[PDB]
Amino acid sequence: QAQGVLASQALSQGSEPSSENANDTIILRNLNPHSTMDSILGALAPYAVLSSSNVRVIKDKQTQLNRGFAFIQLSTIEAAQLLQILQALHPPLTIDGKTINVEFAKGSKRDMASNEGSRISAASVASTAIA
């Protein structure tokens, strides 16, 4: 029994600009080598309109298991509003007692634009001999 132990919350911020390429992408932490995509998809189910395109999970090199993090791509404003929601929730997919943090792996902003250019890569094609 205790009923006499309480703590406070705190925050931090602080970033400087870098790169060109960024996209407002949420990042997961606290995860385990065995965690599934499911935990993330289940958490965001009623709070997003996304799928397993958005939810991605880089593995380790020494193993073929996870690296304790994962990714979610979002719209700019939506990334910067979803984050605050996620500070209060966790999915039922608690493998190995693993609840799910929230953090924000953005960088730069965006603006509206377009592009144009070619996309070709070739050299030659030869794949036989004779004898």
From Swiss-Prot:
It is found in: Nucleus. Residues 24-107 form the RRM domain. The modification N6-acetyllysine is found at residue 106. It comes from the Eukaryota. Changing residue 119 to H: In a colorectal cancer sample; somatic mutation. It is linked to TARP syndrome: A disorder characterized by the Robin sequence (micrognathia, glossoptosis and cleft palate), talipes equinovarus and cardiac defects. Binds to ssRNA containing the consensus sequence 5'-AGGUAA-3'. May be involved in post-transcriptional processing, most probably in mRNA splicing. Binds to RNA homopolymers, with a preference for poly(G) and poly(U) and little for poly(A). May bind to specific miRNA hairpins. Associates with the spliceosome. Component of a large chromatin remodeling complex, at least composed of MYSM1, PCAF, RBM10 and KIF11/TRIP5. RBM10 transcripts also code for an alternative open reading frame (alt-ORF) coding for the MINAS-60 (AC P0DW28) protein. MINAS-60 and RBM10 ORFs are overlapping and are formed by shifting the reading frame. This is RNA-binding protein 10. It comes from Homo sapiens. The chain holds residues 277 to 408 of 930 of the full protein.
